[PDB]
Amino acid sequence: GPPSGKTYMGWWGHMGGPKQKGITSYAVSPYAQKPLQGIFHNAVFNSFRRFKSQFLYVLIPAGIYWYWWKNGNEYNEFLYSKAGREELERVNV
Amino acid sequence: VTDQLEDLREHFKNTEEGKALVHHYEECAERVKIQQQQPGYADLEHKEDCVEEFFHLQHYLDTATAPRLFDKLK
Amino acid sequence: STVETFISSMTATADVLAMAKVEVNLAAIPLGKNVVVKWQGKPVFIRHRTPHEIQEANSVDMSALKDPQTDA
Amino acid sequence: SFSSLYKTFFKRNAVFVGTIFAGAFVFQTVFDTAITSWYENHNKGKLWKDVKARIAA
Amino acid sequence: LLFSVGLFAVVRMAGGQDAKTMNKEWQLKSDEYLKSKNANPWGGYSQVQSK
Amino acid sequence: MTAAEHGLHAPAYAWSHNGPFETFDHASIRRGYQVYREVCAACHSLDRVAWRTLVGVSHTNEEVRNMAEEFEYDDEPDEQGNPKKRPGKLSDYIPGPYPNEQAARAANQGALPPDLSLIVKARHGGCDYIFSLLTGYPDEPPAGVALPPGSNYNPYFPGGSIAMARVLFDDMVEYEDGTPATTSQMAKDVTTFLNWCAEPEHDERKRLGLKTVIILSSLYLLSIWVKKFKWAGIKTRKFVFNPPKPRK
Amino acid sequence: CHSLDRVAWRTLVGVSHTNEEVRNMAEEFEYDDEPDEQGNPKKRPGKLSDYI
């Protein structure tokens, strides 16, 4: 089996990442834990915090495009109502 | 007795007549079609009408209250 | 040659290469109604144009049309 | 409360598959029967079971 | 609270049907009869309770 | 677009067959069949469904066979090749006065009658759409609109004119009760029957759907618990960094 | 006495009969084809798409 192409990541033992020393992990079995120890605190506090964090980039474009669509809808409704015989002829020229 | 939907229409339009505000459009349609209904020239096909949007809004408003009184005896 | 033979096998056969013919009577069509008849894979309009509509058809400005085409 | 009587039942593997599948079959059968019964008794008159007596004289 | 609502539901299911009259249409007829004449206080608001 | 022919949306009525935990009120489908067959017989076709689904939900065992015996279905020719006439079967399709389609367009004084087997889903809206179309049309067109001679009006339906003969007069249905002779009852009957014909599986579909949503909800909660369980040992592991001694 | 009613008519052109006779005597057999508006059956002899 010929070796494959040169790639940064590979198989176990040769991740290719920088050699590191001084890192210590501390795991513990899921059997000796409460599997839902903090579900409520997460789903309330962390969810609200993430929503507040993302509340500065999402709603503005939605609102501006909603205003654009609504203004177009109002223009369309007003054009074909008591103005189609005098205003609609001077817009289709 | 042999009148269910029409009776509901009657009662609902009576309630509307208690605050009658759309029949001014009925009378403006009457004056439009009593004053502007005699084009003797045959090259006209765009008679203006203050009825279509009037009728649409009237039926929509009165029928918005219609889906009630489920006395549909079977 | 093989690709051409396969394509010619895939393409239209003998029976589809025959065009159908149909006749529509113009006596029963109403003046203010539209009649659409299918011909050989696609429909065909049959409308009794009013005399007023003929004038509108033949009095269309050419500058407003990208393709110059008259009614006649 | 988990005595040795219940502890012993958590060691068989070769035979546990067949009995667990049979238990699943029994559970699905009883669940289907219960759901059918509840759909039956949640709607009376509309269903076709009692229209036979309704049309009966 | 969950035990309360669950036990109430199961005991109600075990109770069984015990009302051959007073359906929705019965209440509709009664309310129409009461709120059709005799100086109705603005037609009343006697909506049917539930199933 | 322009609301004149776009069609104003009908309000969402309340039916017996619009809900999550419901069935067809097929105590009235036995009545919807009569209301359809008494008036709509020589008007439309509906020829898409068979009679094997008309037993057990609208008729029990015998009247279907009476109807089969009532009509002739143009049997196979005999050994002489001559045509004959035979009673119908219980696995045939609902017939129609027109041979196949020819007698329809000749008598309608206009267009063709659409197949009612799918009109319930053939238009936007749905169950209430046909009710609004058959109820909301007045007996007189709006002021200033002169319809073509011989055409009626309907404001709800986009188009403002149809070849429909307004055969909806009451007082001539009277099955065995006082229910008929008012437009609402027959309108509800016809719309429920048309919905059933367009979808003769509503009860079974809803039962299977209830079972499926129950089992998938249980499985979804189960997967939630197990994922939160066996990821507990990896979502809590902590790292501590001690700088190494300064010697390469 | 036997059928041979399995082939179309466009295959007999240019093999034994040229074009004139097969299409000319394509007007010697009725076929009970499409009717008129009233539905009365119309018999006109068939064309290239007609089989044997």
Ligand SMILES: CCCCCCCCCCCCCCCCCC(=O)O[C@@H](COC(=O)CCCCCCCCCCCCCCC)COP(=O)(O)OC[C@H](O)CO
């Ligand atoms: C009024 C609606 C009622 C719906 C009832 C059915 C659904 C019940 C759901 C569980 C009860 C609600 C508990 C409160 C909300 C929990 C939300 C949450 O974040 O909790 C866990 C959510 O558990 C999941 O894994 C949820 C997977 C979400 C899948 C993608 C999002 C879809 C929408 C989810 C909500 C709606 C689900 C039902 C939609 C019909 C934690 O996330 P995680 O397990 O991925 O861990 C991440 C981290 O540790 C945070 O602590």
Ligand code: HEM
């Ligand atoms: C007996 C009562 C009738 C009922 C319940 C009924 C029902 C319907 C329905 C639902 C439609 C289509 C509506 C839609 O667009 O979704 C329709 C269309 C039509 N019906 Fe009826 N109909 C009846 C009577 C008749 C009669 C007597 C005729 C005449 C013989 C007729 C001829 C037509 C035609 C020609 C159309 C199509 C109109 C078009 O293409 O513009 N109908 N009918």
